[PDB]
Amino acid sequence: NEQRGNLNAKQRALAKDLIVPRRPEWNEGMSKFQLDRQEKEAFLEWRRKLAHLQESNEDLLLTPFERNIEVWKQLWRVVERSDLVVQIVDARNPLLFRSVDLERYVKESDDRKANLLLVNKADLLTKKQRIAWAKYFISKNISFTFYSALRANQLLEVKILSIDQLEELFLSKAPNEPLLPPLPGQPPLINIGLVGYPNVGKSSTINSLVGAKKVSVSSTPGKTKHFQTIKLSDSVMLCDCPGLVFPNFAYNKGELVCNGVLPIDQLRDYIGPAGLVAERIPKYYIEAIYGIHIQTKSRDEGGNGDIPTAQELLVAYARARGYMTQGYGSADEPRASRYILKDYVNGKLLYVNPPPHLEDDTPYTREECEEFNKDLY
Amino acid sequence: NPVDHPHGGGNHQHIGKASTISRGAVSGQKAGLIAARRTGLLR
Amino acid sequence: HRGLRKVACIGAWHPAHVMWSVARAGQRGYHSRTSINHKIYRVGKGDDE
Amino acid sequence: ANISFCRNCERFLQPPGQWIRAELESRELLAICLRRLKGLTKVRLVDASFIW
Amino acid sequence: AQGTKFRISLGLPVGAIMNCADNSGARNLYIIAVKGSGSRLNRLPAASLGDMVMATVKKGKPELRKKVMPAIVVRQAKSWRRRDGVFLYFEDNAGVIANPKGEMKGSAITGPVGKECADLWPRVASNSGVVV
Amino acid sequence: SHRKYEAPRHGHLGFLPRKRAASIRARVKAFPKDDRSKPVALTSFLGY
RNA sequence: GUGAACAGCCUCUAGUUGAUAGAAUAAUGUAGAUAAGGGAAGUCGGCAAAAUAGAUCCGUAACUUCGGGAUAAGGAUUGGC
RNA sequence: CUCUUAAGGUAGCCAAAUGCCUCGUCAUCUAAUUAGUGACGCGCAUGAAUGGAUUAACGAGAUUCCCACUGUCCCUAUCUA
RNA sequence: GCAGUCAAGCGUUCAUAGCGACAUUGCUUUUUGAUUCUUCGAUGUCGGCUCUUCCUAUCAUACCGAAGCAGAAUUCGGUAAGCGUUGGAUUGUUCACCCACUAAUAGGGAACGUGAGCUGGGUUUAGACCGUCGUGAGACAGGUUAGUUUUACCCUACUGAU
């Protein structure tokens, strides 16, 4: 598509403005308010720098970000005490949840402070795509460590990039390898610090590690937020920030709530997000899962094609079992928009993104469709 | 009802006092775990 | 109960009398009426076929 | 328009009598459009995201 | 906006679902009000052939739904008395949607149009194919 | 307490009593005003 | 006799023809009904009523303890000679 | 480290038949919804045989919505014992 | 709840077109308090439905006066209760709150009109679950479910009839 090639290249010229609030130096700063006044102006100026983006670009409509200052302080304590700052990415959109701009803030107080990218549910994708995935991560030279949070995996049916194409076990040997000495000398344990977005399993993963459920789901509205550390190894401590969101970029506004960015239970204008699920799945795949027999595509009455619409999917899915409106029965589209977008994020309606390259994206993407089913023979 | 059994009555269904009853009670009190030297699920 | 083709509330407590303006069943029809402004169209003779 | 505010305790006054204590610059986008005189007559309140 | 029309028999109260005669995407209209209706305790205000009703779209294009917009009745199933003598009635009810001036949003009308609607509304007679 | 929903009266009060008339020939209560310039003619008529 | 039927309806053997009656046809009732166009706007609430119903043939979803759900839904046919 | 002679709500669940403030807040359904559903939880006063959560089937049990239908209504009229 | 007086000041430059600080005199019994006079050998104790009449402190309609009344649209005031004052979503609601039409959707009274006129949703019997409190019987004017609504033929009143 011509629209795909232009709107990808527009974002690349504007990536440099996003930065962070950075804690300028405070050397002694004994203070009742003078450290606080010193820390306001870093975030207050960074708030102004993102405000100039709205005049600069048109229809740029970016991700929401933590506008509360006290949430950003909980990032500051975790990035400071940890020698390893760690990013959790979803593998359905690996380029989006990653922030390269935070890694610049990691190398500031470095003494070989490192960057790590651990990326979950690799078994969902396929064998073929992860080979094509492995090319991009090394070329930008940060990290790639796939995994899947299962103690016994069921992944039934040139070494150079295919050796790390296999994801990893439940083992913590891969965080054990990068940094052997501690950055403060006196503690025997080092630490590692975890930063990721909410609705990506940063709490679902390290629940399984400690096995005692200390990490539990996102914090209360009335508090500051939190900050929590947990000790599980001979030689590493765990730290995680309260989950927050970085201002990277966003396109078309549907992909945000289609992913785990915006809440599904709060959404307005459901036509867009239900339109993205329509084209990015073939016809008989939904017909195997729910058994809708949608067809209705007007199929040589108004136009030519096999592509779906946002209307005719939500109607036909809710022209199944129930789901009628008050006063008159017109099939209740918005109630059916919840149960489709929840099955998108949970992984019934799975899709893999094209791997990024300088401007181009393909019309014909790679796919995954199992011909077998428990009901289909 | 409270006339029918010593566990009876109340605005909920609860016993009210300890169900373990001494060996040396009288007929009419012995309704419950009689002379329980232990109770609960065994370990 | 006991009838629906009626009038429910005849009156208030005070005055303790049924007023003259309530609706009440009795004779209908066979009254003297005057109806004005009826326009004559045809006055035909007797011995006229 | 005019919006009332607790200077000490950070609340917002709704038109009848309420005092909904909302998080600042997050969901006050949603509590204002009830107080506004304009109703649903305006086309499609297609988007709303306040500026700094 | 509505001129003089001789009284004809009221066949469409509030809550009626009449068809949609035009080609503006809507399939049927749900009558919620009649412009210029009266006032009587417990009485539903009713429409007629040629009245102007406020109505919503229950079925059709999703752009047209969930908004209240005025509409004009073009057919009626209750029989009415014309002054020249005859009692006539169509087979089903029908209406076309309009702006509050009285101009019409659709382009054409399928089915016949009642004659007392074509005299009263100038735009409906412009788009009418068959007049009774 | 007030009527809670106002509505006009049922019926007409200038036509009371609804009692049966005194005779099947209804009376003429009033005749038109006399104009003595015109020739002699009657004022009403009886018919079936 | 009809029918799947000791159902409902009409008949033979057997039994009864007893329950205060006559004349009129106002309202308001009790019991049984029908309705133009709209179709729950009535109402605390589809309360009461209406619609579907026998059989034969095609056709039957989510879910499921895999037994069910099921008469699912939905759509045709029916006399006489 | 420590105060109350023990221990400090774990797994789950929610404005629930259990939430005072309260017609909670945000979506949603509707022309309009103190009702209904999906969420969120410093929960006045939820919580694990004073059993917790989940459930096919079953119900003259409670609740909201739709299709078909209709004098429940617009608005009353008529007939029979 | 409603209406006066007095004037500092607002009304881009002016006290009273329209508003009225600081004070001060009143009316009303549709709020809510206070009191215990009448009824405990019982006045059937919410709300709606149905129907008639009354009040003016007037929303609409008639004719008028003033304006910071050019027209249009409006605001203030007079005579005036003759005549109108609604259809719906939610709640048991009165109240409230929206949507829509309209000339306009004014406020009230009559034993907080009206149960031998109704319905029984609610409250306030007995059944039952939950929450907190109580060692316990039990408690809650906290939440949710299920629960019989009787008689007129007498007199007067009224409507018709001798």
Swiss-Prot record, chain A:
Presence of keyword Phosphoprotein: yes
Enzyme Commission numbers on file: 3.6.1.-
Function of the molecule: GTPase required for the nuclear export of the 60S ribosomal subunit. Acts by mediating the release of NMD3 from the 60S ribosomal subunit after export into the cytoplasm.
Miscellaneous note of the record: Present with 19400 molecules/cell in log phase SD medium.
GO MF annotations, alphabetized: GTP binding; GTPase activity; mRNA binding
Gene Ontology CC entries for this record: cytoplasm; cytosol; cytosolic large ribosomal subunit; mating projection tip
Subunit structure: Associates with the 60S ribosomal subunit. Interacts with ARB1.
GO biological process: protein transport; ribosomal large subunit assembly; ribosomal subunit export from nucleus
Residue stretches making up the CP-type G domain: 72-247
UniProt keyword list: Cytoplasm, GTP-binding, Hydrolase, Nucleotide-binding, Phosphoprotein, Protein transport, Transport
Family stated for the protein in its record: Belongs to the TRAFAC class YlqF/YawG GTPase family. LSG1 subfamily.
Principal cellular location given in the protein's record: cytoplasm
Effect of I88T: Impairs the nuclear export of 60S ribosomal subunit in cytoplasm
Domain notes: In contrast to other GTP-binding proteins, this family is characterized by a circular permutation of the GTPase motifs described by a G4-G1-G3 pattern.
Name of this chain's protein: Large subunit GTPase 1
Subcellular location: Cytoplasm
Binding-site residues, GTP: 120-123, 196-203, 240-243
UniProtKB/Swiss-Prot annotation, chain B:
Locations listed in the record: Cytoplasm
Family classification: Belongs to the universal ribosomal protein uL2 family.
Entry function: Component of the ribosome, a large ribonucleoprotein complex responsible for the synthesis of proteins in the cell. The small ribosomal subunit (SSU) binds messenger RNAs (mRNAs) and translates the encoded message by selecting cognate aminoacyl-transfer RNA (tRNA) molecules. The large subunit (LSU) contains the ribosomal catalytic site termed the peptidyl transferase center (PTC), which catalyzes the formation of peptide bonds, thereby polymerizing the amino acids delivered by tRNAs into a polypeptide chain.
Subunit structure and binding partners: Component of the large ribosomal subunit (LSU). Mature yeast ribosomes consist of a small (40S) and a large (60S) subunit. The 40S small subunit contains 1 molecule of ribosomal RNA (18S rRNA) and 33 different proteins (encoded by 57 genes). The large 60S subunit contains 3 rRNA molecules (25S, 5.8S and 5S rRNA) and 46 different proteins (encoded by 81 genes).
Miscellaneous comment in the UniProt entry for this protein: There are 2 genes for uL2 in yeast.
Name this polypeptide is given: Large ribosomal subunit protein uL2A
Annotated organism of origin: Saccharomyces cerevisiae (strain ATCC 204508 / S288c)
Lineage: Eukaryota, Fungi, Dikarya, Ascomycota, Saccharomycotina
Shown stretch of the complete protein: 205 to 247 of 254
From Swiss-Prot, chain E:
Keywords, ordered alphabetically: Acetylation, Cytoplasm, Methylation, Ribonucleoprotein, Ribosomal protein
Record's subunit section: Component of the large ribosomal subunit (LSU). Mature yeast ribosomes consist of a small (40S) and a large (60S) subunit. The 40S small subunit contains 1 molecule of ribosomal RNA (18S rRNA) and 33 different proteins (encoded by 57 genes). The large 60S subunit contains 3 rRNA molecules (25S, 5.8S and 5S rRNA) and 46 different proteins (encoded by 81 genes).
PROSITE patterns: RIBOSOMAL_L14 (PS00049)
Misc. remarks from the entry: There are 2 genes for uL14 in yeast.
Molecular function via GO: large ribosomal subunit rRNA binding; structural constituent of ribosome
Transmembrane portions of the chain: none
UniProt subcellular location: Cytoplasm
Matches recorded under Pfam families: Ribosomal_L14
Native source species: Saccharomyces cerevisiae (strain ATCC 204508 / S288c)
Primary location class: cytoplasm
PTM characteristics: Methylated by RKM1 at 2 different sites, but it is unclear which are the 2 methylated residues among Lys-35, Lys-101 and/or Lys-105.
Residue numbers of N6,N6-dimethyllysine PTMs: K101, K105
Similarity-based family: Belongs to the universal ribosomal protein uL14 family.
Name assigned to this protein: Large ribosomal subunit protein uL14A
InterPro entries attached to this UniProt entry: Ribosomal_uL14, Ribosomal_uL14_CS, Ribosomal_uL14_sf
One GO cellular component, as annotated: cytosol
Superkingdom of origin organism: Eukaryota
From Swiss-Prot, chain F:
Traits of the deletion mutant: A mutant confers resistance to trichodermin, a trichotecene toxin produced by plant-pathogenic fungi.
Domain of life the protein comes from: Eukaryota
Location of cross-link Glycyl lysine isopeptide (Lys-Gly) (interchain with G-Cter in ubiquitin): K38
Modified residues (Phosphoserine): S23
Annotated localization: Cytoplasm
Recorded family membership: Belongs to the universal ribosomal protein uL3 family.
Protein role: Component of the ribosome, a large ribonucleoprotein complex responsible for the synthesis of proteins in the cell. The small ribosomal subunit (SSU) binds messenger RNAs (mRNAs) and translates the encoded message by selecting cognate aminoacyl-transfer RNA (tRNA) molecules. The large subunit (LSU) contains the ribosomal catalytic site termed the peptidyl transferase center (PTC), which catalyzes the formation of peptide bonds, thereby polymerizing the amino acids delivered by tRNAs into a polypeptide chain.
Other known facts: Present with 450 molecules/cell in log phase SD medium.
Protein's recorded name: Large ribosomal subunit protein uL3
Organism of derivation: Saccharomyces cerevisiae (strain ATCC 204508 / S288c)
The encoding gene: RPL3
